[PDB]
Amino acid sequence: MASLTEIEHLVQSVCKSYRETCQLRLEDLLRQRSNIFSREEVTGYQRKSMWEMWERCAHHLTEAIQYVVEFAKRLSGFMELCQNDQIVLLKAGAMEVVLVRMCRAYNADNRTVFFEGKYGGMELFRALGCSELISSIFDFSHSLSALHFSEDEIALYTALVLINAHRPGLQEKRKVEQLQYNLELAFHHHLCKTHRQSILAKLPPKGKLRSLCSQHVERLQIFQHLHPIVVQAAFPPLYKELFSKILHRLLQE
Ligand SMILES: COc1ccc(Oc2c(Cl)cc(NC(=O)Cc3cccnc3)cc2Cl)cc1C(C)C
């Protein structure tokens, strides 16, 4: 199964699907690198209530997840899997894909991230009350930024983050294994062709992405225990379904 010409066709198909479903083009994020939050704007964010900052972040993550769902729908073989398997994969990998895509909005020179039109450091998120999680996200983004990923590398890498045949709950495991294997060949083929196989040993262990998503679910539970009505009344329905049935509807479009 799958010859060399079919693997190269898969490479281009994945890259195209990724370009079409980017929340912001890479150049839009680079051109904004000198637009940094002033000391006064940072204090403004710090002084916001914990629940207002949590609602803002849950709204931005929901928007980013919506682009990830669209990327999955454009991925060759994804819409062919059963609906149970599509939902199992999006439920475990959607936040993981948002976290890898986050490195494009991260500036390693000054340790800032793009958020609401400008760049700011970790201290912008102090009001969330989950400094360890933000810190882990910034470290993960910094570690990814040290690899100097091209857009095509991110497309192939995030396709593999999403198409994981080890997710518990998968009914047609072999069908996901075949698609994962084809995407692995496409990723390794593209790395070999462009003299970039050296990044393979430097890719983060799979347990690191799982650790960030687990910390996110735990910090959300702490916040939801303190503010149940805020989550119920002001958090996006899709965010609550993933982390706290919108997905079936999003998938049928
Ligand atoms: C996994 O959990 C979390 C993850 C992140 C987080 O705060 C953010 C958010 Cl919401 C957005 C951005 N940047 C962006 O969304 C910037 C962006 C915009 C458009 C295209 N690419 C990137 C940066 C950060 Cl650090 C908080 C939590 C939890 C604590 C709620």
Residue 101 CB contacts under 8 Å (≥ 6 apart), including other chains: 22, 23, 64, 68, 154, 158
Q: In units of Å, what resolution does this entry have?
A: 2.4
Q: Which residues, in sequence order, are bridge partners of residue 36?
A: 119
Query: In three state form, how does the secondary structure of 141-195 look?
Result: HHHHHCCCCCHHHHHHHHHHHHCCCCCCCCCCHHHHHHHHHHHHHHHHHHHHHCC
d(CA 207, CA 150): 23
The angle, 0 to 180 degrees and rounded to 10, between the axes of the packed helices 173-193 and 4-20 is: 90
What ranges do the domains of the chain cover?
Answer: 1-253
88 lines ligand 1 (CB under 6 A): no
d(CA 51, CA 130): 12
d(CA 59, CA 63): 6
* Residue 2 CA to ligand 1 centre (angstroms): 37
* Residue 24 CA to ligand 1 centre (angstroms): 13
Question: For 77, left (φ over 0), alpha (ψ -120 to 50), or beta?
Answer: left
d(CA 83, CA 94): 15
**Which residue type occupies 105?**
A
* Method used to obtain the model: X-ray
89 lines ligand 1 (CB under 6 A): no
How is residue 202 written in tokens? 């430097």
Element (H, E) at 73: helix 50-74
Cβ burial, residue 76 (10 Å; 0-12/13-18/19+): middle
Cα separations (Å) of 29 from 26, 103, 111, 210? 5, 11, 14, 26
End-to-end CA distance of the chain: 31
